[PDB]
C-alpha cells in the first residue's frame, strides 16, 4: 500500500597498452599481481605512478606522451590509510577525479577501472573497511552517466588479497557482461543490484541536525506528531534561524517540549558541549543527522578539495555524532543519504561522495553492534528531474516510510517514488546499465 511501492535496497547477486595508475611505494604487491593477470590476456603493462594530490594539467601532458593506450586500471584506493583527519580528504578521491579529467584532456578514448579494498561488503557477514572509499563508488557512478567514454567501472576486493584479482580481472575489463559495479570474493564474483523490499516510538530527548531548516523542519514536526517527549533542534543559526520562533510554537502545540540550539556539527567541541548540555532528567535517545550539503555542477570541474569542503556538516557531523554516542545506549542513529549515492544522476557529483560515507558508516556501525540507519532519500517538498523519472514525495509520505524502515531496523533502505518507464530510458539514454535488471 502506497509506501511499499517506493521502498528498495541494494543486494549483491552472483554474476560474472594498459596503464596501472598507482602511488609510489603503495599497492606494489597488488600492482605486480594486476600486471601478471593483464599481459596473460595479451596487453603490454606499463606503470603510471602518481604524485599525492596531482595537478591535472601536468598529468594531462604525461598522458600526451605514452602513445596509443587501450585502457587504465587504478590502485590509488588500494593499500591506503586515512591519517586521522577529514574522511573525504582521501588522496585517491581527489586523484581519481583529476585522473579522469586528465585522460579526457589527453583524449585517450580508453576507459578507467578503479579497484577498492573491502569498501562494499557483499551482505552483513563482511565489514566495510574504510567508509571513505565508498565516495569513489558514488562519484564513479555519476562519472559514468556524465562521460561514458572514460568510465569502465568499479571492482571491490577483500582488504589485502591479490588472489581474486589474478583470475577474474582479465574477464572484468573485456567481458561483454555490462557489469560496471563488481565485487570479487573467495566464494565467486558478485554484481551490485537494485531490488524492491519486503514488508519504534521516540524517548527521552531526540536530536535533529538541520532541524531549523527544511527536511529537518519536517523531521522535527513529524517526530512531534508521532508523540516525542523532548526535541533538541540544532543548526549553525539555531534560534536566530528564520521562523525558528513559529516552529517551536507549532510543535510545542503537539506535546513536545522542544529547544533550538546553535551548533556547528563539524566541530568536535561544539557538539561535545551540546551533548553535555542535555538534562540528566531527559537523556539522549535518538539522533536524525539531516544537515545538508549544497554543491551543484558537473564532474568536468569538481575536485576532491571542493567535495571535502562542501560536505563537512553532513560528513564530519556523522563522524562526530557517531564518535560521541558510541558508548551511549540510544534507540535510532538516523543518517540522511540520497539517490545520488544509490544510483547517481548527472549533476549530483557534489552530493554522491558525502552520502556514500553515510551509507558506509551505518553498515560498519550495525557491523560493530550499534543502531544505525542510512536512508537514501529521493526528492521531497517545496521540472528537469520530474521529467527524467524521479518525482517528489510529500513530507508525511516520506516520514511514514521512515517509520517502518526503523520498525524493520534495516541498515540502508532506499525510499523514492520512481516512475520506472521514463527513468530507465533516461538513465540508459547514453550508457547501458545492468543494475536495474531485477525489477
Amino acid at each position, epitope marked *: 500500500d502506497e509506501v511499499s511501492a517506493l521502498r528498495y535496497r541494494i543486494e549483491w547477486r552472483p554474476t560474472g597498452t594498459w596503464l596501472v595508475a598507482k602511488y609510489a611505494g603503495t599497492a606494489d604487491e597488488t600492482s605486480t599481481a594486476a600486471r601478471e593477470a593483464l599481459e596473460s590476456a595479451g596487453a603490454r603493462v606499463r606503470e603510471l605512478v602518481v604524485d599525492a594530490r596531482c595537478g591535472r594539467d601536468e598529468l594531462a601532458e604525461r598522458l600526451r606522451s605514452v602513445g596509443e593506450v587501450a585502457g587504465v586500471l587504478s590502485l590509488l584506493a588500494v593499500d591506503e590509510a586515512e591519517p586521522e583527519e577529514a574522511p573525504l580528504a582521501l588522496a585517491s578521491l581527489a586523484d581519481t577525479l583529476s585522473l579522469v579529467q586528465a585522460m579526457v584532456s589527453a583524449e585517450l578514448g580508453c576507459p578507467l577501472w578503479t579497484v577498492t579494498e573491502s569498501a562494499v561488503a557483499t551482505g552483513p557477514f563482511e565489514r566495510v573497511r574504510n567508509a571513505a572509499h565508498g565516495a569513489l563508488w558514488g562519484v564513479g557512478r555519476v562519472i559514468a552517466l556524465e562521460n561514458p567514454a572514460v568510465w569502465g567501472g568499479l571492482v571491490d576486493v577483500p582488504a589485502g588479497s591479490v588472489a581474486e584479482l589474478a583470475r577474474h580481472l582479465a574477464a572484468v575489463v573485456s567481458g561483454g557482461a555490462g557489469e560496471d559495479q563488481l565485487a570479487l570474493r573467495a566464494d565467486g564474483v558478485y554484481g551490485r543490484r537494485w531490488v524492491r523490499a519486503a514488508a519504534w516510538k521516540p524517548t527521552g530527548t531526540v536530536l535533529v541536525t538541520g532541524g*531549523t*531548516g*527544511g527536511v529537518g523542519g519536517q523531521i522535527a514536526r513529524w517526530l512531534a506528531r508521532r508523540g516525542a517527549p523532548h526535541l533538541l533542534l540544532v*543548526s*549553525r*543559526s*539555531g*534560534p*536566530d*534561524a*528564520d521562523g525558528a520562533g513559529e516552529l517551536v510554537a507549532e510543535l510545542e502545540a503537539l506535546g513536545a517540549r522542544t529547544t533550538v540550539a*546553535a551548533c*556547528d*556539527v*563539524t*566541530d568536535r*567541541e*561544539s557538539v561535545r558541549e551540546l551533548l553535555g548540555g542535555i538534562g540528566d532528567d531527559v537523556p539522549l535517545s535518538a539522533v536524525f543527522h539531516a544537515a545538508a550539503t*549544497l*554543491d*551543484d*555542477g*558537473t564532474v*568536468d*570541474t*569538481l*575536485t576532491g*578539495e*571542493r567535495i571535502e*569542503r*562542501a560536505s*563537512r*556538516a553532513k560528513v*564530519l557531523g556523522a563522524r562526530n555524532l557517531h564518535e560521541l554516542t558510541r558508548e551511549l545506549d540510544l534507540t535510532a542513529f538516523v543518517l540522511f543519504s540520497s539517490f545520488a549515492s544509490a544510483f547517481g544522476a548527472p*549533476g549530483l557529483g*557534489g552530493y554522491a561522495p558525502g552520502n556514500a560515507y553515510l551509507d558506509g558508516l551505518a553498515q560498519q556501525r550495525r557491523s560493530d553492534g550499534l543502531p544505525a540507519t542510512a536512508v537514501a532519500w529521493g526528492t521531497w517538498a517545496g521540472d*528537469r528531474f520530474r521529467r527524467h523519472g524521479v518525482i517528489e514525495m510529500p513530507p508525511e509520505t516520506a516520514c511514514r516510510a521512515l517509520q517502518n524502515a526503523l520498525d524493520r531496523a534495516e541498515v540502508c533502505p532506499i525510499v523514492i517514488d520512481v516512475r520506472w518507464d521514463r527513468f530507465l530510458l533516461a538513465y540508459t539514454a547514453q550508457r547501458p546499465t545492468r543494475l536495474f535488471d531485477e525489477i
Partner: antibody, heavy 122, light 111 residues
Framework: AEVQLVQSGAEVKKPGSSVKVSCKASGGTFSSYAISWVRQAPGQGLEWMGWISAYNGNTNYAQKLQGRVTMTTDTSTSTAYMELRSLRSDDTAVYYC??????????????WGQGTTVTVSS | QTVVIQEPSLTVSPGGTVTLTCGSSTGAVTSGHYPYWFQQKPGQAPRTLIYDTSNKHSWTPARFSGSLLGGKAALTLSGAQPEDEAEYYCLLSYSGALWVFGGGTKLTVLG
C-alpha cells in the same frame, strides 16, 4: 584564478524605477558555480544580497530584498544579471558580483567584480 | 537575526603586528562558518586574503594570517606596511545558504 568578472557601467536612477546590473565571467568555465552579489552604501559596509546558480538557475535572496530583487544567468553570454525593482534613495550603493576561481567552491567569494555605482535620487 | 561584530577601527605602526577579530551574536564562530577575510583599499573592490578560516590565496601577502582565537575569527597582520592601510571585512556562512558580513575594521597604518 584567471577568471575575471566585468560589470555594467555606472547607472543613475529616480525613485520607483529599476536597475539591471550585469556580471560577465571571462577567463574560465562558467557552468558549475553560483555568482553571489553584495552592495555597499557610500562609506558603509559590504552587505550580502544573494546568489544565482549558473548550473540550475536556483536563487537564495537576502530577506530584506525578497520581492524586489531578481538574479538571472545567460549561459550563452556567460554573464549573471542582478535586477532591483521599485528603487528608493537608500538603494544608492556600489553593487559587486563574486564567485570562485577556476576549480573552486560552488557558493564562493574568492574573485570580485570591479563594482557598479548605482545612484538613485530625486 | 545573527549580527557579526568587528572592531570599527584600529591603528598599527609600520613593523607592528595588529590582530582583528570577527565575533557573532548567535555563538562561537567556528570553521563550519567558513570565515573569509577581505581587504578594501579606498576606491577599490574587495580583494580576498583568507578563505576557510585559515587558507591563503597566492596573492595574499605572507604577513597576513587567519585563525580562530577563542570563539571569534582573527586576522593577524605581522610587520604591517603602509600599503596595508585598508578596511577589512569578515564573512560567515549560516543556515539556509545565508551569509552575513561584519561591519568592517578601518585599519590605519601611521605613515
Amino acid at each position: 584564478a584567471e577568471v575575471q568578472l566585468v560589470q555594467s557601467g555606472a547607472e543613475v536612477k529616480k525613485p520607483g524605477s529599476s536597475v539591471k546590473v550585469s556580471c560577465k565571467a571571462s577567463g574560465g568555465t562558467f557552468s558549475s558555480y553560483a555568482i553571489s552579489w553584495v552592495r555597499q552604501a557610500p562609506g558603509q559596509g559590504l552587505e550580502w544580497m544573494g546568489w544565482i546558480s549558473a548550473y540550475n538557475g536556483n536563487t537564495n535572496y537576502a530577506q530584506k530584498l525578497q520581492g524586489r530583487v531578481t538574479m538571472t544567468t545567460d549561459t550563452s553570454t556567460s554573464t549573471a544579471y542582478m535586477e532591483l525593482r521599485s528603487l528608493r534613495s537608500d538603494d544608492t550603493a556600489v553593487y559587486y558580483c563574486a564567485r570562485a576561481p577556476n576549480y573552486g567552491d560552488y557558493v564562493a567569494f574568492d574573485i570580485w567584480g570591479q563594482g557598479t555605482t548605482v545612484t538613485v535620487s530625486s | 537575526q545573527t549580527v557579526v561584530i568587528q572592531e570599527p577601527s584600529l591603528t598599527v605602526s609600520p613593523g607592528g603586528t595588529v590582530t582583528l577579530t570577527c565575533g557573532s551574536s548567535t555563538g562561537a564562530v567556528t570553521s563550519g562558518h567558513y570565515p573569509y577575510w577581505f581587504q578594501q583599499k579606498p576606491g577599490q573592490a574587495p580583494r580576498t586574503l583568507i578563505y576557510d578560516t585559515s587558507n591563503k590565496h597566492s596573492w595574499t601577502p605572507a604577513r597576513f594570517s587567519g585563525s580562530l582565537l577563542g570563539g571569534k575569527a582573527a586576522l593577524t597582520l605581522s610587520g604591517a606596511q603602509p600599503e596595508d592601510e585598508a578596511e577589512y571585512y569578515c564573512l560567515l556562512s549560516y543556515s539556509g545558504a545565508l551569509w552575513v558580513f561584519g561591519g568592517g575594521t578601518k585599519l590605519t597604518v601611521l605613515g
